[PDB]
Design an enzyme around this catalytic site. Structure first.
Site: not given
Ligand SMILES: COc1cc(OC)cc(OC)c1
Ligand SMILES: COc1cc(OC)cc(OC)c1
Ligand SMILES: COc1cc(OC)cc(OC)c1
Ligand code: NA
Ligand code: NA
Ligand code: NA
Lengths: 639, 639, 639, 29
Positions: B513, B520
């Protein structure tokens, strides 16, 4: 199309109307409140023996409610929700007024630097480092009046009327709580069929006045007017009673929940014991007891409260607590072994119900169910197929994050609980006002010591007969006698005589809010409903296999590590989410601060709050998926 | 009076209207999307170099976006929110069509059991246990379109336009991210003034191509058209820029947040390090690093990723990730020392930013701020005095539980995050679509390798001059050369030549994305705002004293235990809640998946979501209290 | 007064609000869908054995559901109601994908002129005149989503959760359907107490593996975990179960409905047999079987399907149908006798359930109940006295035509059915998705042939034990063996081995929509409710008398004419309208495409639709009469 | 989206208004 502002505002008005339309049920209680009468000069007045009166002026010699005007004031404060009216209620040790009907004069006030003289028990006299125990007020009296933006309103759902002092149900429930108190230091391996695996005894073996076998025998035997709760056929029971009624007490089903997968496997849910494999290259396994809390860990080891140590076992200790004596965190804990690692045995695995009582004592509201959520996420649990973007990433060309991913549910379990607590805080204070198991435990002693005015404690007579006729009270007085030999309460006068009081796991016993409507069970019922709804409820938890049988875990004799129980069929996501829901809820019954009816009906209430939230939230999502939500009463509802 | 059904429904309609009335701001971007043009046969077309294009077909030789039609399709899928349109977008390695304007033909499909042949990097070729890395799709593309019941709508708040490739700001931000990547294994004690205490080096000392002193020197020096970001006076900058602008880079303020109490004390917040005193008779202290998670504990020790090991340091490794190569959890971690207790050093205290990168890699959405909440509750933090029933229990004759107690806030921090994630998921996909720092890191290499068509990569020219003129790129190629000597990527052709790529802390680098709108930081900004609002933000955390100075904590050289930093003034609830908010948000910048603008503007956005929720919820409570909410931009708002 | 435009518009808005106000019940299923799990490489996945999966890819060797992704796609298509999503579902014989989770590749497409090679059965291979059977799709998947102008909405009423594979109810229901299949060529005279009159055998006497006596014996004996459905007392059963529960199977009540007047008289309703006296000077009587269809006639003689000929009796024939093999109208019919008149025996009176199966096979939706309406009108039946202008023409000086005459009801019975079909089309597809009796019949064979993966078909184990322990399966395999000696399916490999499949009356068996929510029963329940409401439900049908006993009719041995059954009391309008409602609904159970629960709960649903229409329509009429509507559960409601 | 009860009720009110709007002609003998 509309502009978003309009679209967005409608979704909130649509959700608001949807909630208003859903049946608003009528709040009906057992009517015990103003029924049970006691003598005054002009005539009979309400005793309020069946009611919660913890905090109010209790007669310092008699041990019962001092003045009924304090209760009349206490109620009108709740019904009003006025900060002024509820602060006009006398709290703690108090003197009777000279004019009949007038509110009792409070003993302790904002000019008492030292309060030692006001307490009749030693524990309370030297509580605040010699000064003496402080007063504590009623927790969230007008939280049942507070509204909410999502889920149904606090008074838009109800709980059916509670058991009565003369009822066969209540007699079996208090007998269950009494039995749980004497089995508080039993090894959890005992609470299941021995065909599952070799059972063990708790390393800290100590004086036991009741066995697991005797408890089953007693609970099936105990009866009022020649009728046992479990034995009673459907015809005799009411519609609200038939739903609650349980079968003959079995070694497998004893002290367990009545939802799908409660009876299956060991007593204690896996999510209270197991963790996840260490993030990345696994240093340890799931038997370790370290949850995959993102990057860092959650230690599943609970603090070990000194084995075979109960509180409020005499009149003085009990009375003071019933006069809102703040004795929070005065219980002693085991010091660590310098040689052993991981703060052992100071922190150990939940070995005996003593540890499960310690868990629910300080646990954060969603902690137990958030931890359960994290274990499933770390394990790699499939979500409810109905949820969108669940297909392979290449085919669907989408992934679940904010609205249909891990993040969505992590908050949902937390959201539901506050919506749940408000809903039950009404049922506790505003509607039922059922006494705590400790309060009933007091009445049994007070009656058996021939205390009270005239025919005041006549209602409990029938109860006390049944408990003594199965020879339960005979063991309780013997247990209390040994507990009163402790130096902390040996100086208390009542230690010399016989004590029929219910032994409490905590020094302060129950909190400062009525029994019926369990705070822990409503959060449980609400939280795991959200988990079951979101996750694939059916998903068999594969914790490996050994010799062609599915591996499950339970504590070992000293709580050093988990011990393997090999099952015919494996444990599901639902079963263990339904079992942890019971463990935390029933965990309060082990502490002696709740009944069974408090758990099951709060579990049903919490579920209705959770479903209500999800129903309202489906207006927001434009995908128009479906969520299969399995109910605690068999079949599943589609959202 | 009204009946509750009516009262309750109105509070939800009142909250719904209140949200609709509050200013709905206009969503404005930097316009880089369709501005930066590149040559085609008929004429110039959009390059989309400044845009996020991770997952889309990338030219396997050139390294840039293959076909603009895929981006044109990718956008129309987001704007529609249609599951059909967004699944018609080509994903991963793809072949150009024979007819110009037509969508690129996808290489990998649901008939490719083995995918090894499609990846140009070795790590990706042998990723899925020899089969080869799977494709991964875009996470929550239409979550910005999803509505909510509480808080403001996703498109009812905005973020100002992002920095540009030609702008002085962007050049200093990428230089900061580049510097953070070479200082990824620096001991956190280094990131503060040495007057606070004796600093140390990380036990795992290894090849370092940049020092803390050089990073400060470079960041203050770096400039576009003879103007440095920090040096630039207010007159030159715009209103949206003036708010973001920072002072000259100091040893204290380097890589830190710009909220009250960020600069004060050590870099890392206490809530990432300290725990609580063990429940009951304290076996350990707060320096232990065990949080009072009710009865059980939370271990503050994060998993230790192999020191001085970066990823996507060559063209093949970078390209494959930019073609949605699923390389999640392929990073290696340190094995435990059998002799040492508490799984050391497998799990250790957050010693270097490498560990802070590992924290934010898998952390649960509210985990970081829930943990911070639990530490404050266990410590015994006073709540915002405005909250009712805060007086002595005897005087007020009430206690905070459901509506004004610990339980209320525990859920509030969890609630806010999902409301926050939806709000930013709009800004990421629907509005800005800013490229990830890794993507920009690619353009620098591609430009410096003289790749692209005609005047395609002319925009980044100015950027690459500034970075090379401060001699930052000179160190990046030297660092990458050593990283490419690793056997996992030594076989990759581009290892032989020079590499200007930004070293990534994770094998897969950033998520799927866009960059601008930090997932965060929005959760942080929202969560700690709820904490600050509820708690007494001013409350000085007393962690004891030593020799007439206030004790604070930071990691020791190997992360065995915490090391004392003695301050002139103590640390507040706000300061450390503002500092942890930065730590987790900036923690992504250390990993190299976010800029500074991504943090600060998302932090401001998250706060507006949080305030919006609390504003709407105040209609429910009948007490009509007030909550003082301190803003990240100085003064506090009253709720 | 108002102008009519205003008056008229209000009546439609009033009717619209009235419908919206009436309780909107919650849709709850048995949860079997995602409960029953089966093994995959990563872990356990949903088997969907208890679910309807007819049309989807079925494993060509195993015989079970090929890929769960097809079901996951199939559901999301129904829930969406999108023409695009539901057309992305693979249909018929299909190949498994190379990438796990991806949708199965469809074998048959719009380039297959000849499809012979794709079918494993001979009947299907040479179906389309040598080309091979065509594919057929799911009938009205999104008809449950379609709204209506009169009556309650499709999702404004519900059906309680269906029986389970482990439940005692289901085991007795499939045993009933199995028994009906072996008694498919029994003479209807057998299905009643012999005290009523002399019973006969069907002229086409053939191999019978089960008798009427054995069927009663088996149905009363059959039991799961030592409990029979009919024997089980009220206490054991749930509220939703108690309503459905039937008494001990009697010769009179066997295979009959449970509404007032079902058990009374012969099995088959008069309205399926009798006609009216020929218009004017009667050439024939009511025993003729010619209905007074205005001026012309309706012949009550149904087409005679070749006696003792069943379909889908082996794996190949069954599998192909379960892969949506279009085998409509491939069943053979008896050629006419040139000598005999009235196309005999090509068209004969409904002699055996074989003929009742043929009736419901092609019957028009309201035909059965329109015919019943016409017989009552021609007979000269009194209307519900409550209806206006019912008095002598001279006194009242009015006659019933448009609003309170024959014309009014003639349309009402037709109106209700479409309102009914939409309501149940929701319950079939969107809610329950219960498997067809044929599908369950497959599982029994597949289990008994030890097919399926690991513990996939463990749920049906308990069922198959009960059926085999009463020795029902022992007869089914013997019956199937004789059926597989037919030249059409003798070439099919599985003919050689034993077959436990449920014999189907039609070559294609059930339609292409789920079992629970009977299309025929919902129309019946709705239609006859309108008839009962409008007509005088009590009106004893006087078909003459013989020797001081009331004359009733049933088929003769060859179906040449009707045979007299002389009753103690006569048959009412209600009783015969309730009996025909069962005949058509249960008629599908005889064909083997429905259970009993499918009939009774759909009958209750249909009634609620019908009452709902009439309630809304009463706003239109200005006379403000009343209609007495007798319910299938005893007492009558006033409209 | 709306809940079905609302959607369903609107379709009946929409149909009711549509009929009311269509020309109401004058009855002449
Ligand atoms: C739970 O799915 C995700 C969410 C994320 O954002 C922090 C990163 C991720 O690593 C690719 C996986
Ligand atoms: C579980 O309910 C509670 C019990 C307590 O001990 C008296 C305190 C409390 O305040 C947070 C809540
Ligand atoms: C009774 O339901 C039906 C059964 C059918 O045979 C497959 C076809 C059909 O289309 C009119 C309807
Ligand atoms: Na996925
Ligand atoms: Na307090
Ligand atoms: Na007439």
């Amino acid at each position: 199309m509309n502009t978003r502002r309009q679209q967005a505002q409608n979704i909130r008005n649509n959700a608001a109307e949807l909630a208003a339309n859903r049946p608003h049920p009528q709040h009906i209680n057992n009517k015990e409140e103003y029924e049970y009468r006691r003598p005054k000069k002009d005539g009979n007045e309400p005793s309020h023996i069946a009611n919660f009166t913890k905090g109010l002026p209790h007669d310092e010699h008699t041990g019962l409610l001092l003045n009924s005007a304090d209760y009349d004031q206490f109620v009108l404060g709740i019904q009003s929700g006025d900060t002024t009216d509820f602060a006009r209620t006398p709290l703690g040790p108090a003197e009777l007024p000279k004019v009949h009907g007038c509110l009792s004069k409070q003993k302790i006030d904002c000019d008492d630097d030292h309060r030692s003289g006001f307490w009749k028990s030693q524990i309370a006299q030297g509580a605040a480092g010699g000064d003496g125990a402080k007063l504590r007020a009623w927790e969230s009296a007008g939280a049942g009046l507070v509204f909410d933006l999502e889920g149904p309103d606090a008074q838009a759902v109800t709980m059916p009327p509670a058991p009565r002092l003369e009822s066969p149900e209540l007699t079996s429930e208090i007998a269950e709580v009494y039995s749980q108190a004497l089995l508080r230091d039993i090894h959890f391996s005992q609470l299941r069929d021995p065909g599952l695996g070799d059972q063990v005894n708790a390393c800290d073996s100590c004086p036991t006045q009741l066995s697991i076998y005797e408890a089953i025998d007693i609970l099936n035997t105990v009866q009022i007017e020649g009728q046992n709760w479990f034995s009673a056929n459907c015809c005799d029971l009411t519609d609200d009673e038939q739903a609650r009624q349980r079968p003959l007490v079995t070694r497998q089903n004893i002290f367990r929940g009545i939802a799908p997968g409660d009876d299956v496997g060991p007593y204690l849910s896996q999510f209270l014991l197991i963790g996840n494999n260490a993030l990345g290259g696994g240093v340890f396994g799931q038997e370790a007891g370290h949850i995959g809390y993102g990057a860092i860990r959650i230690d599943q080891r609970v603090r070990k409260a000194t084995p075979c140590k109960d509180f409020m076992t005499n009149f003085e200790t009990w009375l003071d607590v019933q006069n809102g004596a703040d004795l929070r965190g005065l219980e002693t804990y085991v010091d660590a072994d310098p040689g052993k690692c991981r703060e052992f045995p100071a922190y150990r695995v939940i070995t005996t119900p003593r540890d499960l009582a310690t868990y629910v004592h300080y646990d954060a509201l969603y902690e137990a169910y958030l931890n359960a959520c994290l274990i499933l996420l770390g394990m790699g649990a499939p979500f409810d197929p109905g949820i969108p973007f669940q297909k392979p990433d290449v085919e669907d060309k989408q992934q679940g994050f904010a609205h249909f991913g891990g993040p969505q549910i992590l908050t949902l379990v937390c959201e539901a609980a506050t919506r749940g607590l408000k809903a039950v805080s009404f049922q506790k204070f505003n509607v039922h006002r059922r006494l705590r198991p400790e309060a009933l435990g007091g009445l049994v002693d007070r009656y058996k010591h021939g205390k009270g005015a005239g025919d005041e404690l006549k209602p409990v007579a029938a109860l006390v007969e049944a408990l003594e006729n199965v020879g339960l009270l005979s063991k309780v007085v013997a247990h209390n006698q040994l507990q009163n030999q402790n130096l902390d309460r040996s100086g208390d006068p009542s230690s010399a005589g016989d004590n029929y009081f219910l032994p409490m796991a905590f020094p302060e016993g129950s909190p400062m809010h009525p029994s019926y409507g369990a705070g822990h069970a409503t959060v449980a019922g609400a939280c795991v409903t959200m988990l079951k709804a979101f996750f694939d409820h059916g998903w068999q938890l594969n914790l490996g296999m050994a010799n062609g049988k599915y591996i499950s875990y339970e504590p070992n004799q000293d709580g050093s590590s988990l011990q393997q129980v090999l099952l015919d069929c494996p444990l599901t996501v639902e079963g263990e989410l339904n079992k942890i829901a019971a463990n935390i809820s029933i965990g309060r019954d082990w502490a002696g601060v709740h009944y069974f009816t408090d758990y099951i009906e709060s579990l049903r209430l919490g579920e209705k709050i959770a479903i209500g939230i999800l129903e309202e939230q489906k207006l927001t999502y434009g995908e128009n998926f479906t969520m299969t939500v399995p109910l605690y009463d068999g079949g599943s509802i589609q959202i």
